[PDB]
Design a protein around this nucleic acid. Structure first.
Length: 210
DNA sequence: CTACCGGATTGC
DNA sequence: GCAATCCGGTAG
């Protein structure tokens, strides 16, 4: 079973589970081979889910991992897809779209980060930088369609904010919730010349399980 | 390609 | 507390 059914070896105690913003001691460019490690770091606590959020508070983090065809990654911004609209019966974790997504649970959480009152028809923020921060991790499985994904594993790419969100018919013909995320982070983007230099100057290397 | 498990977390 | 959810990971 390797890493398929494993739990954490430690938990992040440096900040609590509902911390908004960067995790202390984890710079942009930090890299981990497996999602469980990303969880142990505090950067993205769920081992499987794309969004970490509480539907009455906000979303703390998300992962771009190519798991949702409606995702569109443009590096310094991206269009993210809500979760759900899927039949996971039979103890699945992933499936194709087979019903309309809903503005509930993780999807409502991420909408709350937008600097606009929550709205079932979607919203746009007049001052997007006042929104709640989202920690963004890119996983190599996004690399099928995105040149910004890391070659392997998972990489912390910094703080993004939700500019707007809206419902739209997805590629599979069912409604999906879509979110425009835009970067708001003083640290360089890992894929740029400056980001590559920073990663090197910091001595960051891929973290593997102990 | 197909099938489906633990664990972590939030929903209720 | 128990139910629901799930952008992972592996075996066949």
């Amino acid at each position: 079973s390797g890493m398929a059914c494993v739990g954490r070896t430690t938990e992040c105690t440096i900040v609590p589970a509902n911390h908004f913003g960067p995790i202390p001691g984890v710079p942009v460019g930090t890299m981990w081979r497996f999602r469980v490690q990303v969880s142990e770091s505090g950067v993205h606590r769920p081992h499987v889910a794309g969004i970490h959020g509480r539907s009455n508070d906000g979303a703390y983090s998300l992962v771009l991992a190519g798991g949702y065809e409606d995702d569109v990654d443009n590096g310094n911004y991206f269009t993210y897809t809500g979760s759900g609209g899927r039949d996971l019966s039979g103890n699945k974790r992933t499936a194709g779209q087979s019903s309309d997504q809903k503005l509930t649970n993780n999807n409502r959480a991420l909408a709350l980060n937008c600097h606009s009152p929550i709205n079932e028809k979607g919203a746009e923020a007049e001052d997007w930088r006042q929104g709640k921060p989202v920690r963004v991790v890119r996983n190599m499985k996004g690399g099928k369609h995105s040149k910004y994904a890391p070659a392997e594993g998972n990489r912390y790419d910094g703080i993004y904010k939700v500019v707007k969100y809206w419902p739209e018919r997805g590629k599979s013909g069912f409604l999906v919730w879509r979110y425009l995320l835009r970067r708001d982070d003083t640290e360089p983007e890992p894929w740029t010349r400056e980001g590559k230099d920073r990663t090197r100057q910091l001595g960051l290397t891929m973290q593997y399980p102990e």
